[PDB]
Amino acid sequence: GSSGSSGPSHSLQAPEVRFSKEMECLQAMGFVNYNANLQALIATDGDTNAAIYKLKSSQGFSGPSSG
């Protein structure tokens, strides 16, 4: 809808909004799974590393990449 633009957080704000900067970083990596990342984030209270560690762990159609 509106690219960027976001004021301060008064109280009780969206999750993805809070961990947005992350959701974006995740995507870059390839973690498009939003509904997942989002939850994962909330599960890590805003933590990419963990978020990743968790996501990665999860083995249910995401993106098989090894080497």
Curated annotation (Swiss-Prot):
Source species, domain of life: Eukaryota
Coiled-coil regions listed: none
Domain UBA: 13-58
Chain ranges passing through the membrane: none
Name of protein: Ubiquilin-like protein
Residues of the full protein shown: 557 to 610 of 610
